[PDB]
Amino acid sequence: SGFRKMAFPSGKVEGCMVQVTCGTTTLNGLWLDDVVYCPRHVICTSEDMLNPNYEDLLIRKSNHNFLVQAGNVQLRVIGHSMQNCVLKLKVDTANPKTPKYKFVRIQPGQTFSVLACYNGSPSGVYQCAMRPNFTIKGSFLNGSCGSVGFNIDYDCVSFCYMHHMELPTGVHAGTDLEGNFYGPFVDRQTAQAAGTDTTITVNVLAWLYAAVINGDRWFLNRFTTTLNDFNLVAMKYNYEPLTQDHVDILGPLSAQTGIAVLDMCASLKELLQNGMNGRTILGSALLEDEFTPFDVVRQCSGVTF
Amino acid sequence: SGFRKMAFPSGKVEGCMVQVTCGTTTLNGLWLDDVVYCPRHVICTSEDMLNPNYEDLLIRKSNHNFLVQAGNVQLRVIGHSMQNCVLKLKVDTANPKTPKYKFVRIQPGQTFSVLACYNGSPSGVYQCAMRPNFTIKGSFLNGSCGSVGFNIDYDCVSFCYMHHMELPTGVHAGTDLEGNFYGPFVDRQTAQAAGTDTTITVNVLAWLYAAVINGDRWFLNRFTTTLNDFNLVAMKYNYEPLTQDHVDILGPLSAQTGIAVLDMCASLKELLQNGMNGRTILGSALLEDEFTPFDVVRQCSGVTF
Numbered sequence: 357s358g359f360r361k362m363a364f365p366s367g368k369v370e371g372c373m374v375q376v377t378c379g380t381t382t383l384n385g386l387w388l389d390d391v392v393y394c395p396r397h398v399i400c401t402s403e404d405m406l407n408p409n410y411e412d413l414l415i416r417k418s419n420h421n422f423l424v425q426a427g428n429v430q431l432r433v434i435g436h437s438m439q440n441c442v443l444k445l446k447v448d449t450a451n452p453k454t455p456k457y458k459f460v461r462i463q464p465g466q467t468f469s470v471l472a473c474y475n476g477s478p479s480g481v482y483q484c485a486m487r488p489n490f491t492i493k494g495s496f497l498n499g500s501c502g503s504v505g506f507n508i509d510y511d512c513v514s515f516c517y518m519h520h521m522e523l524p525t526g527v528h529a530g531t532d533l534e535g536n537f538y539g540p541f542v543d544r545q546t547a548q549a550a551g552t553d554t555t556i557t558v559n560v561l562a563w564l565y566a567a568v569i570n571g572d573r574w575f576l577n578r579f580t581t582t583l584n585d586f587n588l589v590a591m592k593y594n595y596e597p598l599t600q601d602h603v604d605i606l607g608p609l610s611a612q613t614g615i616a617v618l619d620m621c622a623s624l625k626e627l628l629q630n631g632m633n634g635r636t637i638l639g640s641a642l643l644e645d646e647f648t649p650f651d652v653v654r655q656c657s658g659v660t661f
Numbered sequence: 662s663g664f665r666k667m668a669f670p671s672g673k674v675e676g677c678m679v680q681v682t683c684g685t686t687t688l689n690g691l692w693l694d695d696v697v698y699c700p701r702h703v704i705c706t707s708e709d710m711l712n713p714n715y716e717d718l719l720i721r722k723s724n725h726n727f728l729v730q731a732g733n734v735q736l737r738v739i740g741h742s743m744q745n746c747v748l749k750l751k752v753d754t755a756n757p758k759t760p761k762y763k764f765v766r767i768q769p770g771q772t773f774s775v776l777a778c779y780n781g782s783p784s785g786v787y788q789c790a791m792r793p794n795f796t797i798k799g800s801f802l803n804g805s806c807g808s809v810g811f812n813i814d815y816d817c818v819s820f821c822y823m824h825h826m827e828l829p830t831g832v833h834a835g836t837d838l839e840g841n842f843y844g845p846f847v848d849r850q851t852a853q854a855a856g857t858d859t860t861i862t863v864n865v866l867a868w869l870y871a872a873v874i875n876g877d878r879w880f881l882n883r884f885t886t887t888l889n890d891f892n893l894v895a896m897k898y899n900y901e902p903l904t905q906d907h908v909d910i911l912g913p914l915s916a917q918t919g920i921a922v923l924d925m926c927a928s929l930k931e932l933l934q935n936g937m938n939g940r941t942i943l944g945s946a947l948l949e950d951e952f953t954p955f956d957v958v959r960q961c962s963g964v965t966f
């Protein structure tokens with residue numbers, strides 16, 4: 357019992373983090389096999405960030421301008437290339453601590469653990485979601501670029517995120533491990549505003565099912581609704597519209613609890629129209645949207661890695 | 662920028678977890694050097710838990726009744742002993758993955774990371790606090806006994822908690838690594854009720870300083886107060902009383918922000934008397950008490966391990 361924002365154990369990723377330095381700029385890299393992956397803005401000065409021509413800047417750089425250190429031990433750089441927004445540094449040694457892994461591009465609403473790093477070293481781990489506006493609500497300071505987000509299934513680390521930047525509103529943007537940004541952001545110090553941050557409705561439902569499983573049941577009501585009717589309400593409160601794919605994904609939680617999805621939706625609707633009246637759900641006074649249905653079942657069934 | 666409930670990287674502790682089985686009961690152990698530490702209720706059947714005589718039960722057990730597995734590899738048990746509520750199994754091999762470590766007994770209000778484990782394997786990591794009533798508000802299922810709580814400073818893992826039980830109210834109780842319970846709980850299936858769960862006032866203040874640092878400033882007011890006056894208010898809202906030791910510990914945050922502690926206290930007081938009026942602070946609609954002043958500075962300054 358209990359319900360916490362829980363991250364994956366970070367040990368498999370800790371072994372992969374290194375420090376990459378180019379000229380006077382330092383950030384974090386991810387060493388997998390004989391490749392180090394890092395943000396291409398490793399090659400810029402802070403002045404360069406106003407309007408960088410990365411191709412032009414990279415011509416001035418050789419293999420020996422890229423220092424890569426793993427713990428206190430220096431890697432030899434034998435090749436470099438740019439893919440989208442990331443640099444791929446070929447080194448002469450395979451990482452012996454390399455886990456089984458995959459690169460995945462996640463969808464908005466999906467969750468992942470972040471291992472925040474500075475200077476190639478782990479400082480902390482936390483969970484977050486890809487928001488519908490393709491930002492994450494991270495915790496990251498100067499030097500945290502190259503930190504990565506990941507999921508773990510049994511033996512296999514799926515890398516989904518690499519951190520690149522903070523917006524002036526204090527939320528975070530980054531890439532997949534092929535270098536392509538999530539959302540419209542670019543790796544330049546320019547005006548970039550994030551769009552509407554909608555609430556991940558299927559996640560909120562999953563969390564209400566979690567609450568029921570844990571004994572918090574005060575918000576169950578006598579009502580049901582329809583997908584069309586609930587969606588009129590979600591639109592008004594800036595919730596993402598619920599589809600039948602979502603309903604399908606909630607079917608295990610619905611079965612475990614005996615609460616039909618549409619009845620849970622009617623519960624949600626009343627909480628939106630009426631608020632929480634100063635009450636809490638699973639220790640929160642807000643509706644939580646950063647647990648996926650898979651997260652809830654995993655946490656409430658004790659899956660290990 | 663941003664502010665998250667962040668756990669320590671778990672890799673140093675992942676290497677220490679093992680599975681301990683006695684008869685048909687299985688839980689988690691912590692292998693450090695040539696000792697495996699685990700909850701003594703490893704030796705009970707679920708029937709035994711009603712009223713166990715652990716000394717009597719342990720006479721029936723030899724070295725070879727204790728199976729210890731690390732990954733898929735069996736350890737040889739060469740000695741056993743009971744210290745308070747834990748068992749110490751001497752094995753013939755030192756753990757090669759043993760980190761620098763210490764056993765510490767923490768005070769109520771202090772925070773730590775939990776590596777939840779089942780069958781000797783990591784499933785997730787999260788932060789929590791020792792509550793003033795000596796419970797923790799964990800996330801733990803059957804088989805999670807032996808999981809441990811820890812802090813990390815640079816190279817050194819300080820183990821503070823080992824999980825033993827869930828109360829009928831769904832909060833958690835456990836020991837230090839010498840086997841002594843936090844609070845009055847016993848390792849028996851008996852009526853055990855937790856006392857008043859007070860709010861950790863110095864932690865809430867620290868979190869308000871965190872909010873200020875991150876740009877959330879709406880709740881700053883024009884008032885100040887006195888320690889005596891604030892405490893009349895804390896008592897009424899079931900907050901722990903603030904002492905001058907607390908004020909001293911908040912002095913770095915006070916200096917960083919230029920907000921005198923007593924002025925921040927007056928802010929707190931108004932939030933207690935008036936509530937949040939449907940607003941949020943650092944993404945919460947409640948006042949958060951599970952960040953210590955040290956946690957806030959660590960997170961807001963990028964310390965690594």
Ligand SMILES: O=C1C[C@H](C(=O)N2CCC[C@H](c3ccccc3)C2)c2ccccc21
Nearest residue numbers: 405496497498499500501521522544545662
């Ligand atoms: O979360 C982050 C990452 C960021 C960072 O480490 N930068 C150095 C590397 C180049 C970065 C950059 C990217 C785009 C545009 C202009 C500059 C800034 C930062 C700076 C301050 C606070 C928080 C954070």
Ligand SMILES: O=C1C[C@H](C(=O)N2CCC[C@H](c3ccccc3)C2)c2ccccc21
Nearest residue numbers: 357710801802803804805806826827849850
């Ligand atoms: O958090 C926990 C740990 C607990 C556990 O794994 N137990 C097996 C081992 C003996 C335990 C026990 C302790 C005291 C009294 C009676 C029995 C019960 C449990 C059971 C269900 C849900 C959550 C949890």
